[PDB]
């Protein structure tokens, strides 16, 4: 089997992407944030504290003839940005882009943090990291991908995120029309439960490529590109007037600037992030200070190849017995 679904930016900055997901019988369609940095499929629901729901579409398990309470199971997750959610668990039928999993754990939120409430466009998350990170207790549950894997034509999914435009998540096949040149594959460590890999270096603009190993995670659920302070300083030093602002929480730059591109290495191959992808706009409405899309990972504890990086590529998440990651230009 295969599946193919369009993923759409939630706003004009590509802060996140939502993908429609069918849950239950009859189908209830919710727009979920597909997150290769976590492993829980959780939704706003009829059980979510009323004051914490503000515009989201909710899953109502009592209206699904295939929903079953997973007795005694609870979940609770905290994300790298300090947001969180928790609740109980149902199993139900879940379909993405024509691909159906029966008996998928659907984690129903009883509580969500303010960042989730305040984002009316995101109805929940669909985790696509390794199932070892799943938070359901006392019986850990499998991701949608893990459940689908054996049925898929090939045990893979791909992320093709757009810049200020829709893109695609495919399951079970590689669309050879969706990228240019060849796909370069690179080793993955699953030791921390992430799609963790090692970039071979970087360049700033038209500058020379610096060969250096950068361990990090391919994370569709993180907006920006978080890299070591040395690398990030070298990038912003090429933008007149750019500076790190402790008050704002990162590098800012004059909105009048033209940003250089940023290249990252994948083996001997190179992925080029155009300068415009690194512009996250005014820090506040009407400001002439703009927020940068490349930020320091210092104090995160891990480098994160988030959407800024991934949207410059066609990315293969290969879930074969020994997982790997593939990147192609597009």
Instruction: Return the residue matching tokens 């590509």.
Output: 14
Structural domain boundaries of the chain?
5-174, 175-330
Q: How many CB atoms lie within 10 A of CB 234?
A: 17
Give the Cα separation of 129 and 133 in Å (integer).
7
Considering just the CA atoms, what is the radius of gyration of the chain in Å?
A: 20
Q: Could you give the count of Cα atoms lying within 13 Å of 208 in the half-sphere of its Cβ?
A: 3
User: Does residue 154 carry a catalytic annotation?
Assistant: no
Q: Do β-strands 3-9 and 84-96 pair in parallel, antiparallel, or remain unpaired?
A: unpaired
Residue 316: φ, ψ to 5°: -100, 125
Beta bridge partners of 112: 85
Question: How many angstroms separate the CA atoms of 73 and 82, rounded?
Answer: 23
Separation CA 9–CA 17 (nearest Å): 4
Distance, in Å, from the CA atom of 79 to the CA atom of 222, rounded to the nearest integer, reads 10
d(C-alpha 100, C-alpha 66), whole Å: 13
CA–CA distance, 108 with 42 (Å, rounded to integer): 6
The CATH architecture to which 5-174 belongs is Beta Barrel (2.40)
DSSP β-bridge partners for residue 292: 279
Known catalytic membership, residue 279: no
Whether residue 215 contacts residue 252, with contact meaning beta carbons closer than 8 Å, is answered with no
252 contacts 242 by C-beta, under 8 angstroms = yes
Q: Are 234 and 290 in contact (CB under 8 A)?
A: no
Tell me how the structure was determined: X-ray
> The tokens of 141 are what?
């549950």
List Cβ neighbours of 312 (8 Å cut-off, separation of 6 or more).
Answer: 163, 271, 272, 273, 274, 277, 329
* Alpha helix positions (H), the chain: 114-117, 144-148, 229-236, 307-310
DSSP state of 194: S
- Residue 220 phi, psi dihedral angles, 5° rounding: -65, -20
Least Cα distance to 311 among 284, 261, 272 occurs for 272
Question: Encoding tokens for residue 152?
Answer: 């898929």
Left (φ > 0), alpha (ψ -120 to 50) or beta: where does 309 sit?
Answer: alpha
- Tokens encoding 232: 């990030």
Q: 113-152: b or e for each residue (b if 16 or more CB lie within 10 Å)?
A: beebbebebbbbbbbbbbbebbbbeeeebbbbbbbbbeeb
- Cα 66 to chain centroid distance, Å, stands at 28
Encoding tokens for residue 13?
């900055």
The β-bridge partners of 30 are 21
Tokens 């008050």 correspond to what residue?
247
| DSSP strand pairing (167-171 vs 294-296) | unpaired
- List all residues 6 or more positions away from 264 whose beta carbon is below 8 Å from its beta carbon: 199, 201, 202, 214, 270, 271, 273, 305, 309
Given 14, 33, 35, 219, the catalytic residue = 35
Q: Which two tokens stand for residue 70?
A: 């997973």
Q: Does the fold of domain 175-330 match that of domain 5-174? A: yes
Active-site position among 45, 131, 199, 296: 199
Q: Which fold has domain 175-330?
A: Cathepsin D, subunit A; domain 1 (2.40.70)
CA-to-CA distance for 124 and 41, rounded, in angstroms? 7
Distance between CA 176 and CA 300 in Å, rounded?
35
Query: What whole-number distance in Å separates Cα of residue 58 and Cα of residue 129?
Result: 24
Q: Are strands 225-227 and 294-296 parallel, antiparallel or unpaired?
A: parallel
């Amino acid at each position: 089997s295969t599946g193919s679904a369009t993923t759409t930016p939630i706003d004009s900055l590509d802060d996140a992407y939502i993908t429609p997901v069918q849950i239950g019988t009859p189908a209830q369609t919710l727009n979920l944030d597909f997150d290769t940095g976590s492993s829980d499929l959780w939704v706003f629901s009829s059980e979510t504290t009323a004051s914490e729901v503000d515009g989201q579409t909710i899953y109502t398990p009592s209206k699904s003839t295939t929903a079953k309470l997973l007795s005694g199971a609870t979940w609770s997750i905290s994300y790298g940005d300090g947001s969180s959610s928790s609740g109980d668990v149902y199993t139900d039928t879940v379909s993405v882009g024509g691909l159906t999993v029966t008996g998928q754990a659907v984690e129903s939120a009883k509580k969500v943090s303010s960042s989730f409430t305040e984002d009316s466009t995101i109805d929940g998350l669909l985790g696509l990291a390794f199932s070892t990170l799943n938070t359901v207790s006392p019986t850990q549950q499998k991701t949608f991908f893990d459940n689908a894997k054996a049925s898929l034509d090939s045990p893979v999914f791909t992320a093709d995120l757009g810049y200020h435009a829709p893109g695609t998540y495919n399951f079970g096949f590689i669309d050879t029309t969706a990228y240019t040149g060849s796909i370069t594959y690179t080793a993955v460590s699953t030791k921390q439960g992430f799609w963790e890999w090692t970039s071979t270096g970087y360049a700033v603009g038209s500058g020379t490529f610096k060969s250096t190993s950068i361990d990090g995670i391919a994370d569709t659920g993180t907006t920006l590109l978080y890299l070591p302070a040395t690398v990030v300083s070298a990038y912003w030093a090429q933008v007149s007037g750019a500076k790190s602002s402790s008050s704002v929480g990162g590098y800012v730059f004059p909105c009048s600037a033209t940003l250089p591109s940023f290249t990252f290495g994948v083996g001997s191959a190179r992925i080029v992030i155009p300068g415009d992808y690194i512009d996250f706009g005014p820090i506040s409405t009407g400001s002439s200070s703009c927020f940068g899309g490349i930020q320091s990972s210092a104090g995160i504890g891990i480098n994160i190849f988030g959407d800024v990086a991934l949207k410059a590529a066609f990315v293969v998440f290969n879930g074969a017995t020994t997982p790997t990651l593939g990147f192609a230009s597009k």
